RNA sequence: AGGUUCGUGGUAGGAGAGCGUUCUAAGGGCGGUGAAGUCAGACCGGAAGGACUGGUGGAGCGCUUAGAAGUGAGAAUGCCG
RNA sequence: UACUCGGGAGUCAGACUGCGAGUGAUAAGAUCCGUAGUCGAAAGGGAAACAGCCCAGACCACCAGUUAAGGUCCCCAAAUA
RNA sequence: CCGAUAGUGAACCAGUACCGUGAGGGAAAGGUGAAAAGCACCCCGGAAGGGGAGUGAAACAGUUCCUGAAACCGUGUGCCUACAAGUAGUUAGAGCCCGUUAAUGGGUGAUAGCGUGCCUUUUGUAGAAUGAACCGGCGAGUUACGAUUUGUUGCAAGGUUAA
């Protein structure tokens, strides 16, 4: 009958930029995912890119609670015969802040094309200062 | 040793993407005008570097 | 001729099994599942 | 404006000959013919003729410029298949197939 | 008499190959494999005609939820005070109204809040 | 300006000389059908109802009674030899919208 | 004919009402200004199904009420092409 | 509803779960009874997926509402109560 | 009663071809047109085969010749497609392209939700249990005479004939 869905490319997207210090990962992450899916407008449409572009600074002082920066494990495989790799989270927020915000944001978008395109428009940094000043963002509370 | 399944006509048709054939090198003759191979002799007018063959 | 019409009731329409199991008589034709009263002329005697 | 030839019943198997009817369609007919001449397959004489025959009752029967045709389309279909047999090993045989194809080929100007 | 079968078979056949249009290769062609592709898809249009509303309805509350936010409320407390006031728009309308007439939409936000 | 109005079971959002399809209504093609269930009109001024704005009611005219385009109903049940086919067609009246009062 | 109430998942299985095919009889029709068959369409009926329009085809075929059956196929490591 | 008389049947491989017993080792998705349920022959919602557990019985249509079990940070509808 | 997979095995040079040492077993295969008027002549080609011209109502009836379905093989083109994990659909849905038995119309579909073929046999099968390469034709509760029960009709303390 009548009801509204967005056109790809009508809803007018934001930049925003969000200071990670002293935040846990997953408050943070659960967060930006809402933003990033375009949740907070009344105009989403589930089939349509309707959110907006993330820059986070400061990640190397997200916060982890309990013992998680020596108890908590991420894992890779190659695929090859005995090809399993382990690293903590604590020496990823030492060396590769931006990796470990990239995979906390990336376990809670949709897992298909559009959750694809939707994890490109994070950007992530360890220090205080990011790279699009032209893109005039916006400063954003959680 | 056995096809498990029959194959499809989309897949047959993808595997005949490159059982073509190319197109001969050949150039006109300066003698006659007709066209021939390069370095072969002219079988329309037995020449080949300007001289009779 | 072209007219005629028995008296209701005394003229009834035969029942086809084996046609199609929209009638309800479709595959095993009424008779169950692998017995002797399944199987062609099977079946005991009287008593 | 059109002319076509035809030859049916070729006892060649349609796929040998569509491999080569391919790298002739939409080309001016003299360069048509001589890819056909340096191609060495064995489907090419017969296409060749069947080329030969269109232009020349194109130009015959309809009076058109025999230096400006291009080939228009040209194709394979099938024909009536020879069944055949081959004898195996353990007294068993095995069939063959002899296929025929028609060729047609169809010029025009510019 | 004899009766010899034609002309039917092919027709009721054919009835099925045609409502098979569109479909992946022998889906499209071949009866045996059309029919069974004509039988799921009845089948599933008759479960999606189930699905559709709860699907609309989801999306709706969603749409009021995120316009509700921005006015200081959630959708419960929204929902709770809107039936507190004796007032009964739908989803459907009221997210119409989100996305469309959005000052109407703070005019009733605006009503619940007063009957909480 | 425009109404929210309650017909057939459910609500709709109607403006003048706007063309509806609701569900059948007695009455024939030409006559004058007056809806009083508003519960909102909006416009300049909003008119919230308590779940009714009072007194307020919206006039139309009646175009066609039709039925809808025919859908096919199926359901079988795999391994149990069962089938079922049905054919359905639903009844609309189509109106258009006259005056909101 | 109209109401009121209670119902309407379903295998083996019981009961009912129908669709379509070939032939016969009577009535009444169509058809070289184009029959049957075949092809294509966005039409109609609650289902099985039924029309209408155009192409091909080139000589026979519907409808009504009855009657009689070699009476409807997707599967049988089915038979033939 | 029950019963009596008459026409037509199919069924005689059952499964799991709770409770009460035997056998077994106070094992078994074991085996054999009693008692109730569901599946068989039951789709829908929840247990990730998952005949037999929990909720609940599909005449058809709707882009309407309220609830059950289960839930309300993100995937994913609803409390960062 | 059949109408060319039917009816004889055999509508056609059929107990033939073919198989077997032999006794023996045992096929496939109908249709130009009313009338041969069965395409003089020209052109490409060794021919076959075509393109004209001519005959005919028709040659898209041209000596396996009425009609001419499907599988299967091709040529052309409107829409989509080279970051994607697909029982192939269905529901939602832009964009592009059309214009109907005219009606809340047709083709294709980026992206999003949901979704383990059909049959048989089973307590239980998406099943790694069975069967089917695909398309077409053919292919399974009948008849005779008795018994019993229900319905219908005629006559009724009677009813009914067999040869
Ligand atoms: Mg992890
Ligand atoms: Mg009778
Ligand atoms: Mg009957
Ligand atoms: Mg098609
Ligand atoms: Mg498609
Ligand atoms: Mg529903
Ligand atoms: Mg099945
Ligand atoms: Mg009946
Ligand atoms: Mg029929
Ligand atoms: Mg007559
Ligand atoms: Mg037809
Ligand atoms: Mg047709
Ligand atoms: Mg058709
Ligand atoms: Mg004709
Ligand atoms: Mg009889
Ligand atoms: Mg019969
Ligand atoms: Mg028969
Ligand atoms: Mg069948
Ligand atoms: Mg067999
Ligand atoms: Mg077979
Ligand atoms: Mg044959
Ligand atoms: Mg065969
Ligand atoms: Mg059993
Ligand atoms: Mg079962
Ligand atoms: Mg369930
Ligand atoms: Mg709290
Ligand atoms: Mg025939
Ligand atoms: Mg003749
Ligand atoms: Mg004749
Ligand atoms: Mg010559
Ligand atoms: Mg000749
Ligand atoms: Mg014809
Ligand atoms: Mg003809
Ligand atoms: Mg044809
Ligand atoms: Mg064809
Ligand atoms: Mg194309
Ligand atoms: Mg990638
Ligand atoms: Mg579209
Ligand atoms: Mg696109
Ligand atoms: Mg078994
Ligand atoms: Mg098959
Ligand atoms: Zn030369």
Redesign the interface.
Known sequence: RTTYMAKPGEVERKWYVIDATGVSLGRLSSEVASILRGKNKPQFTPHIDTGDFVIIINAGKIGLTGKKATDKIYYRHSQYPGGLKSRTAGEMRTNNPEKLLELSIKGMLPKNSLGRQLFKKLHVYGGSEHEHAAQKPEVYEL | AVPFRRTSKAKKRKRRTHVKLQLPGMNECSNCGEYRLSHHVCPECGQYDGKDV | LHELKPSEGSRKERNRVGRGTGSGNGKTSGRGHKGQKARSGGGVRLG | TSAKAVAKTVRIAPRKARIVIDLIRGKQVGEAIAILKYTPRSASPIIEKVLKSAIANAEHNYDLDINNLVVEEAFVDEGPTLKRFRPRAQGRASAINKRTSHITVVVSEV | PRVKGGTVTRKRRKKIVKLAKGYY??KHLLFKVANQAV?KS??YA?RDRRQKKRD?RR??I???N??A?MQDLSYSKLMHGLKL??????R??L??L?????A?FN??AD?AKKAL | MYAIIETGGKQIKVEAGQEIYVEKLAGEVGDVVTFDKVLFVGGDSAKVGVPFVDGATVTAKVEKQGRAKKLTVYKYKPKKNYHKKQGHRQPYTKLTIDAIN
Do not use: H
């Open positions: 290769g022998s039988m009845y089948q008759y609309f999306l709706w969603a749409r009021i995120a316009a936010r006031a004796g007032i009964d728009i739908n459907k309308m997210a119409d989100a996305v469309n007439d959005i109407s005019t009733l009503s």
